[PDB]
Amino acid sequence: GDIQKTYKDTCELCHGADGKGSEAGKQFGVPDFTSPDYQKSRTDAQMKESMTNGTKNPNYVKLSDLGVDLADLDPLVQLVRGFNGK
Numbered sequence: 001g002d003i004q005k006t007y008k009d010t011c012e013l014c015h016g017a018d019g020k021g022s023e024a025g026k027q028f029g030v031p032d033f034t035s036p037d038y039q040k041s042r043t044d045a046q047m048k049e050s051m052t053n054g055t056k057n058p059n060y061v062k063l064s065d066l067g068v069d070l071a072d073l074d075p076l077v078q079l080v081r082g083f084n085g086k
């Protein structure tokens with residue numbers, strides 16, 4: 001549905017259809033969302049902080065700069081969690 005469409009349209013280019021990082025995402029330095037070790041290293045609040053505020057890393061565009069509806073943040077975090085263990 002709508003959240004999966006948003007992921008396909010403005011996240012998958014970097015994060016990949018499998019969450020592991022496309023060739024582009026690996027060039028930019030995405031994490032591996034399928035890694036259980038990566039997943040458990042971040043709380044949901046920490047993910048949301050990065051997505052809302054940006055990080056120290058100049059390669060990461062905060063999601064409001066991508067134009068993403070702020071109401072999509074929580075479901076996008078849940079979608080990212082969905083890659084865990086795949």
Ligand code: HEC
Pocket residue numbers: 006007010011012013014015025028029030031042046047050051055057058059060061063066068076077080
């Ligand atoms: C390339 C241009 C990207 C697009 C489009 C999106 N993301 Fe991304 N993301 C990217 C990088 C290079 C990184 C790591 C380095 C950094 O920029 O900070 C990330 C990181 C994330 C994370 C992890 C945050 C954490 O605290 O561990 C999440 C949860 C994330 N990205 C989600 C995400 C979503 C939902 C996107 C579409 C709306 C999206 N990203 C786009 C690179 C790129």
